From a paper:
Sister chromatid cohesion involves entrapment of sister DNAs by a cohesin ring created through association of a kleisin subunit (Scc1) with ATPase heads of Smc1/Smc3 heterodimers. Cohesin’s association with chromatin involves subunits recruited by Scc1: Wapl, Pds5, and Scc3/SA, in addition to Scc2/4 loading complex. Because all eukaryotic genomes encode orthologs, Scc3 is the most important of cohesin’s regulatory subunits. It has roles in loading of cohesin onto chromosomes as well as its subsequent release.
To obtain the structure of a more complete version of the protein, we expressed Scc3 trimmed of its N- and C-terminal extensions from other yeast species. Of these, Scc3 containing residues 88–1035 from Zygosaccharomyces rouxii (Zr Scc3) yielded crystals suitable for crystallography. Diffraction data were obtained to a resolution of 2.6 Å from crystals grown at pH 6.5 in a PEG/KSCN condition and their structure solved by selenomethionine single-wavelength anomalous dispersion (SAD). The crystal structure of Zr Scc3 reveals a long, partly twisted and partly crescent-shaped protein composed entirely of α-helices stacked on each other in a surprisingly irregular manner, given the repeat nature of the protein. In addition to a pronounced hook within the protein’s C-terminal half, a striking feature is a “nose” at the N-terminal end, a morphology generated by a pair of anti-parallel helices that are about twice as long as their neighbors. At the tip of the nose reside three conserved basic residues, KKR (298–300). Though part of this conserved and essential surface (‘CES’) is positively charged, it also contains numerous conserved aromatic residues, namely Zr H337, F339, Y373, W376, and F417. The highly conserved positively charged residues Zr K340, K372, and R416 all protrude from the surface in a conspicuous manner. Though S. cerevisiae Scc3 packed tightly as dimers in the crystals, those from Z. rouxii crystallized as monomers.
Residue numbers in the entry: 88 to 225, 235 to 397, 408 to 581, 605 to 753, 761 to 838, 849 to 1022
């Protein structure tokens, strides 16, 4: 029965705050010192009642319903058993709010917003006020003994909550005791020893005063020992077991508090005996713990030397291999200071500095993890660089000046560029082979992230790059060969680009550094090299007008552009595919347009105009063959098409006729007499562009436009005359490669022009009984018999080119050329499959507007099942 009733009360009991809990959990402006004076005074009056209130406060903070009674705490030999019973009661409670930590992590949502701050303040000062009331020293005071007797068993029990709050109470005690021991030393005993040593002479030692000094010096040291005694204990009872608690949060509190003991009291704590704890938890399975140790190490940076000798390896491994990027990044940050300190071997340095190179696109403006990780690697790189500089210049005196800049600058640039290249070489070993293109793009990117550290070298890199003399002197990577120049300009371009996309930077800064040298750079770099052309034009294209006027260099833009146009003029351009030059020039032309200055536009408008004039010359003089097409395309047609993307190109009746009659319509005869490599570069892309510009006129209205219609009608007739020649039984070159290539490239431009025309025609209102009538007048039917026949032959060539790669057996119409069974062609950029799909897509596009002979082109489906999944997809 007695037991029944106890079980009964246990069951119907609900959560009731104790008095001390209430004041601590709800007071928003509390004098915690007055509070402690009251409680600690009560200890001396009624020990049991204080102890009870203390533990019940702990129980309230964990949201426990259970409570001790004054008799429960009467005996200190009961403590383990009683905590045992509390543990039983608290395990039985199904639901429990951890108020202390809800206050901490969720003040806004918490029933007791101030509870956490008050609780840590209270337990942190507890032991100070104890001292004020002479409860601490008295041999250890029984206050302390009492407190440890109950905190110890609670700190190792099976309830995480009780374990956390006891451990935190113990640690808060130690925050103070550790401060207090040194306090006693440096501020009391030291002050009294001095005055024990100065009141010794002159042969007049006060003797009664030399007795009062040894007296309090002896008291104070006795109490320094009682204090260290409790410090030893809390380590022995708590930290040494709690640092590896199964709960990660008690482990991180252990690291946070040990760091404080270390700052408070290094003579006790700055020793490998305690630092190992950080190093061990470096291998903790929890991301949170590894993060927490890693944030503590910088603060902590001979005990420390021994520490990094023992743990740097693990720190390196984290920065390289850790499953968590935020952690990896933290590691790199620690490695900054280890390097700064000389604790890193050279191979260990490279393994980190080469991390600045990464295959993935990482944006320099982002606040993401990836971006912040590269940024902390750039920080490491910056520090290695500075160390090497000091090491290099340590004995040396350099000249006031090397290679047109301060000696010290030239060295810094040479050391930087050298580490950049050593680092790259490492990166490149750590991964599968990549081509020069990807190589440059990855370097370009690293340079972006280095802008915050090497940005002040931008001006001197420009000047070093325009130096005419030899790169030596009585003593480093310098722009001495062609690979080193490319490294320099890519790195200049990446630095500069990174500087204009860096967030939070004031306007015009990168421009203040490069625009003064930009004319000289274009005037002097080896821009015949497309890699060098790409980097310098890329620098040019970084800047908006506001950049040029601000810097005072708006005046230079035209002379620079003139150089750009002369380099444009001196080159030979290919049809655009994978041509680094075509791409650089194209972007430059766009950029200039985008600046919006008529004076500049005119430089390009006049260039188009000269090109036209000279083409007409070439046309009437030279076409009255491999050389002819080489020149035609290399010096005239590919360049008008490039410029044509940005500025209007129009052939006037005269030139257009010259071009259509002497070239375009004679393409079949011209082609039979060229070499393969020359046939490969034959196309009519310019004809599609001329058209597009006219279509632009027509849409920039919607009253028809005459000669503008005569122009495109005439361009299309030209396509017809080719298709007639090409599809006729008189074509003795039918069936050959060269014949396929011409049919194919001619078809691609034709399809683009016709689709463009039909989409326009359908976008004119019935309202427009003059436009609609004139379009059908000139173009309908859009695709003629011979055009249908050529597109089908082109399709069939591509289909067998892809089929044959796997020796697939195609079905065929009865008079379908069976020689298609043997065709082979290695000449396509990204493979036969790609060209089959694209052509078939262009054919689908026509079919959807229904411009194709549906009966004829049913044929594209005959082998859908033989051609793989993609083709089959495009057919659906």
């Amino acid at each position: 029965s007695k037991q029944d009733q106890e079980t009964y009360l246990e069951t119907i009991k609900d959560f009731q705050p104790t008095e001390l809990f209430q004041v601590l959990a709800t007071s928003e402006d509390l004098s915690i010192d007055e509070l402690l004076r009251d409680s600690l005074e009560s200890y001396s009056q009624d020990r049991d009642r204080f102890l009870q209130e203390f533990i019940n406060l702990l129980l309230c903070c964990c949201g426990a319903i259970a409570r001790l009674e004054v008799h429960d705490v009467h005996s200190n030999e009961s403590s383990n058993e009683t905590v045992g019973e509390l543990q039983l009661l608290f395990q039985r409670q199904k639901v429990h709010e951890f108020h202390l930590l809800i206050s901490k992590d969720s003040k806004k949502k918490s029933k007791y917003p101030p509870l956490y701050a008050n609780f840590v303040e209270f337990m942190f000062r507890l032991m100070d006020v104890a001292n004020d009331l002479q409860l601490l020293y008295v041999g250890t005071g029984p206050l302390i003994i009492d407190l440890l007797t109950w905190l110890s068993p609670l700190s190792v029990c099976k309830i995480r909550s009780l374990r956390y709050i006891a451990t935190l109470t113990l640690y808060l005690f130690q925050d103070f005791l550790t401060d207090h021991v040194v306090d006693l030393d440096k501020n009391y005993l030291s002050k009294l020893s001095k005055q024990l040593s100065v009141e010794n002479k002159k042969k007049r030692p006060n003797g009664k005063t030399v007795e009062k000094l040894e007296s309090t010096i002896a008291e104070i040291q006795s109490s320094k020992m009682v204090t260290q005694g409790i410090i030893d204990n809390i380590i022995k009872l708590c930290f040494v077991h709690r640092f590896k608690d199964v709960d990660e949060t008690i482990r991180c509190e252990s690291m946070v508090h040990l760091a404080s003991w270390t700052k408070s009291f290094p003579e006790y704590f700055l020793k490998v005996t305690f630092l190992k704890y950080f190093g061990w938890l470096l291998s903790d399975s929890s991301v949170t713990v590894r993060l927490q140790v890693l944030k503590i190490l910088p603060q902590l940076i001979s005990a420390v030397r021994q520490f990094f000798e023992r743990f740097k390896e693990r720190i390196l491994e984290i920065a390289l291999k850790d499953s968590n990027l935020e952690v990896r990044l933290s590691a790199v940050q620690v490695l900054v200071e280890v390097a700064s300190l000389g604790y890193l071997e050279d191979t260990e340095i490279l393994s980190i500095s080469s991390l600045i190179f990464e295959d993935n696109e990482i944006k320099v403006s982002s606040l993401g993890k990836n971006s912040r990780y590269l940024a902390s690697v750039a920080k490491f790189f910056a520090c290695i660089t500075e160390e090497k500089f000091q090491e290099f210049t340590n004995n040396r005196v350099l000249p006031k000046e090397l290679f047109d800049v301060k000696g010290s600058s030239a060295v810094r640039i040479g050391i930087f560029m050298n580490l950049l290249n050593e680092s790259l070489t490492e990166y490149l070993q750590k991964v599968p082979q990549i081509g020069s293109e990807k190589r440059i793009h990855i370097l370009f990117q690293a340079a972006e992230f280095l802008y915050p550290y090497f940005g002040s070298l931008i001006k001197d890199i420009c000047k070093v790059l325009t130096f005419e003399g030899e790169f030596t002197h009585e003593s480093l990577l310098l722009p001495t060969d062609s690979n080193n120049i490319i490294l320099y300009v890519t790195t200049l371009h990446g630095l500069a680009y990174g500087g204009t996309h860096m967030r939070g930077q004031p306007k015009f800064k990168v421009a203040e550094a490069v625009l003064p040298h930009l004319d000289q750079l274009i005037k002097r770099l080896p821009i015949e090299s497309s890699n060098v052309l790409a980097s310098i034009l890329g620098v040019f294209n970084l800047f908006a007008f506001e950049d040029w006027i601000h810097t005072g260099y708006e005046k230079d833009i035209r002379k620079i552009l003139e150089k750009i146009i002369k380099a444009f003029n001196e080159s030979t351009l290919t049809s655009g595919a994978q041509d680094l030059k075509y791409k650089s020039f194209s972007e430059t032309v766009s950029q200039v347009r985008k600046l919006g200055f008529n004076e500049l536009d005119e430089l390009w408008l006049n260039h188009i105009s000269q090109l036209k004039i000279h083409l007409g010359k070439f046309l009437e003089e030279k076409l009255h063959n491999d050389e002819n097409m080489n020149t035609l395309y290399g010096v005239f047609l590919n360049k008008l098409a490039l410029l044509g993307k940005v500025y209007p190109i129009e052939f006037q009746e005269n030139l257009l006729s010259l071009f259509l009659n002497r070239f375009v319509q004679r393409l079949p005869q011209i082609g039979v007499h060229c070499q393969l490599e020359t046939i490969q570069e034959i196309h009519l892309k310019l004809l599609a562009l001329l058209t597009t510009w006219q279509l632009q006129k027509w849409v920039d209205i919607l009253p028809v436009s005459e000669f503008s219609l005569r122009t495109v009608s005439s361009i299309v007739k030209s396509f017809k005359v080719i298709f007639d020649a090409l599809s006729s039984d008189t074509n003795d070159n039918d069936g050959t490669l060269g014949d396929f290539l011409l049919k194919w490239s001619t078809s691609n431009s034709f399809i683009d022009i016709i689709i463009s025309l039909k989409v326009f025609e359908l976008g004119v209102a019935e309202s427009e009984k003059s436009w609609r009538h004139a379009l059908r007048e000139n173009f309908v039917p859009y695709v003629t018999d011979s055009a249908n026949q050529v597109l089908l032959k082109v399709f069939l060539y591509l289909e067998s080119l892809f089929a044959n790669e796997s020796s697939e057996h195609l079905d065929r119409n009865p008079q379908e050329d069976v020689n298609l069974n043997d065709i082979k062609y290695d000449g396509f950029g990204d493979g036969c499959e790609k060209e089959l799909l694209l052509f078939t897509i262009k054919l689908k596009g026509l079919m959807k507007l229904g411009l194709l002979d549906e009966a004829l082109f049913s044929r594209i489906a005959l082998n859908k099942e033989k051609l793989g999944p993609l083709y089959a997809k495009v057919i659906e």
